[PDB]
Design a protein around this ligand. Sequence first.
Ligand SMILES: CCCNc1nc(C2CC2)nc(Cl)c1C
Ligand SMILES: [Mg+2]
Ligand SMILES: [Zn+2]
Length: 307
Amino acid sequence: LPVRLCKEIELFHFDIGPFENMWPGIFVYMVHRSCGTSCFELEKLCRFIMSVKKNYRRVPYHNWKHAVTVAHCMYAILQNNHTLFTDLERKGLLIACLCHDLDHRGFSNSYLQKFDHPLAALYSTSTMEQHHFSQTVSILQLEGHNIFSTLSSSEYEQVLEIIRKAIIATDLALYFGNRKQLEEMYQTGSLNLNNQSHRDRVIGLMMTACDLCSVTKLWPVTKLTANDIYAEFWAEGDEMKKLGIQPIPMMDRDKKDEVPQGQLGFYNAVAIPCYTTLTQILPPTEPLLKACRDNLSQWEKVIRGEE
Ligand SMILES: CCCNc1nc(C2CC2)nc(Cl)c1C
Ligand SMILES: [Mg+2]
Ligand SMILES: [Zn+2]
């Protein structure tokens, strides 16, 4: 990792994209700058990182690159909101982010529930999210992978609960209600970060903010990531067609023209409210909202023909 990266990595808009070979090392650095060099035993941490990477499939979007990008956004939020979180939450959230899409197979919760896949019989709601957490626990259970071994049985349970709620929160179906609740608590002046239920909701919104952070990068980066997002959705659509089912337009590769309009709908219904609410609760996260608005403007320009 070069000396030029050390200061860039602190910024919310930082793109890990051009530094693939350095991704494991970038994650270690973020952990060290967040909870110290003695936060985890370096040998166990590397073993855990490398096993997490191998357990992310070669799919167009929910892959290793997405995991590190999400972890980096969490790091930027934590760095700009220091004193707010405990050592356990700092540790827990960075791990949750790296593991939030573990073993994703390129299929949505919609597909798995519609085609009655065994994962949907096991987990009726937040299907893949319940699987991602189960995979995180399995990796921790492996020999020489328990990074939380030094913690007491009480601290271990706490951090696994932090991780569990954080991973489940990445289910976008749960985001709508979470954000409406947080906006209510904030507007009425009842929001209290000392209150555990309020704290869990804030962490949940932080998770959504990180998960969707490709919409907060510089326009060239945001656009290339959207291409990977649609390549994965189109592959699911192709599978649906083979099963005699017409996919939704977003998952249909023959309905490409609808993408800029779909992005506009996504930013207005999901991304803008997410970062607007996050900015209200955590004022230093304002650059994420500003970057999201800039990308919304770029999508409007694509629709108007100025692509
Ligand atoms: C499963 C990925 C969830 N994330 C996103 N989903 C969409 C859908 C196409 C409208 N757009 C964006 Cl930009 C993101 C980040
Ligand atoms: Mg996910
Ligand atoms: Zn994700």
